[PDB]
Design a protein around this ligand. Structure first.
Ligand code: YZK
Ligand code: YZK
Ligand code: YZK
Lengths: 178, 245
């Protein structure tokens, strides 16, 4: 198996930690959801190729501009996350996260991932957002942002229901192999 | 890690580590607080274990089996003895707080009610100054360590055989040389996330809520100082490239 490295980036409330936890355990924890994620090396077989995919989180490094880039050396694929319940997390993608990742990870594929897709049709979410003249991120808004930033592709998932989670990591492995 | 501590922290949570008849005696809010304190100690036990793999398995193994040029092993594992002393001492204090809280007749049932004071002590005074000095040095030497590792693995056959040998066991899957270095760099930024969530469930005793709020502030001040004190070292960097930063 060939070894590849994945790093997930995004704002503090984007759901990146939960996404790594659910994928690495293959389950949304029933008793306790961990606060942090250390690392993990997933055995993934995608399109007949076996890969050891090392997984890393940047949670806790968002306010520390000199510590955060230490997570980037030799990254093969970037998952760039935003939460669908937070149109503000999508706005910080093009002019904060994208120029940083392009600088430290030149030529590395970026997959833009819309997390918490289950909240798009959640009434409590729609009510809270409507108070700030907002609505959950629409699928075309996510695709257009991915197109604009030069992303390898656009994907959505829900760590809560596990829907789309396996597909995100299998596609990330294919991107890392190219 | 030693077997006694590994077994005490084998469960996914505090609610699964204690006996169910003991769990049943506590309110949900106490269980939520104890689950996060348990995660802080469990991840500190794993972090000390990462430092022991670096010092005992890799560093000492290279000194005892390989013929590396002087200064090469220190370049691969900067500050590892100092980091091990800081965290092993901190881990000792956390585990002693848990041990004192055990019920008589039990090696697993406990509730830690006073963590804040221990965190203020760790993140203030001389121990905080030593953490700041050591992480500023370690994190500034991080890129250099990774490049030295890659150079040695690509050109030295005996070095490549040594690495492949000691990292072959399944228990080392997540802990190659480069993985250990990033695990250590990332440890310090996990503390505010853990402390904030402990604080969220520690409002029942006002002294405890105040102590955890003070500890959270000290950890953030330490991180800001470390972040401001980092500049990556590069082998063969010229003075002109440095003063034109
Ligand atoms: C060497 C490297 N690769 C990706 C990022 N970096 C890096 C550069 C400077 C400071 N920190 C990390
Ligand atoms: C130099 C630096 N440190 C952290 C982020 N960046 C950065 C930001 C934007 C574009 N390039 C690099
Ligand atoms: C029943 C149980 N065993 C371990 C944990 N719990 C629990 C208690 C309350 C809420 N959720 C889980």
């Amino acid at each position: 198996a060939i070894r590849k490295k994945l790093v997930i980036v995004g704002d503090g409330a984007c759901g990146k930690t939960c996404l790594l936890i659910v994928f690495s355990k293959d389950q949304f924890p029933e008793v306790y959801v961990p606060t942090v994620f250390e690392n993990y090396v997933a055995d993934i077989e995608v399109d007949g190729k076996q890969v050891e995919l090392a997984l890393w989180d940047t949670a806790g490094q968002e306010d520390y501009d000199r510590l955060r880039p230490l997570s980037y050396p030799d990254t093969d694929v970037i998952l760039m996350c935003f939460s669908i319940d937070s149109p503000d997390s999508l706005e910080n993608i093009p002019e904060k996260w994208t120029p940083e990742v392009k600088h430290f990870c030149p030529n590395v594929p970026i997959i833009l991932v819309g997390n918490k897709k289950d909240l798009r049709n959640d009434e409590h979410t729609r009510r809270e957002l409507a108070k700030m003249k907002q609505e959950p991120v629409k699928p075309e808004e996510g695709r257009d942002m991915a197109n604009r930033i030069g992303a390898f592709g656009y994907m959505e998932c829900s760590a809560k229901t596990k829907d789309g989670v396996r597909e995100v990591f299998e596609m990330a492995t294919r991107a890392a192999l190219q | 890690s030693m077997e006694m501590d590994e077994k005490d922290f084998a469960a996914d949570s505090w609610s699964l580590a204690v006996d169910s008849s003991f769990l049943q005696q506590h309110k949900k809010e106490v269980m939520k607080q104890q689950d996060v304190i348990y995660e802080l100690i469990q991840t500190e036990l794993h972090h000390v274990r990462t430092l022991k793999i670096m010092t005992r398995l890799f560093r000492t193994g290279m000194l005892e089996e390989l013929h590396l040029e002087p200064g090469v092993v220190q370049g691969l594992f900067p500050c590892v003895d100092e980091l091990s002393d800081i965290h092993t001492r901190f881990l000792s204090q956390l585990l002693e707080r848990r041990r004192q809280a055990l019920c008589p007749g039990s090696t697993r049932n406990f509730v830690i009610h006073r963590l804040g004071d221990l965190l203020i002590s760790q993140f203030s005074g001389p121990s905080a100054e030593q953490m700041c000095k050591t992480y500023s040095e370690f994190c500034s030497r991080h890129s250099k360590a990774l490049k030295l590792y890659k150079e040695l693995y690509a050109r030295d056959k005996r070095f490549q055989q040594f690495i492949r040998k000691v990292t072959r066991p399944a228990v080392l899957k997540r802990h190659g040389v480069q993985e250990c270095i990033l695990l250590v760099t990332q440890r310090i930024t996990k503390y505010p996330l853990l402390i904030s969530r402990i604080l969220q469930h520690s409002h029942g005793i006002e002294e405890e809520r105040q102590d955890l709020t003070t500890a959270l502030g000290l950890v953030k001040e330490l991180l800001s100082n470390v972040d401001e004190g980092i500049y990556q070292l590069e082998k063969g960097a010229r003075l002109q490239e440095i003063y034109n930063r």
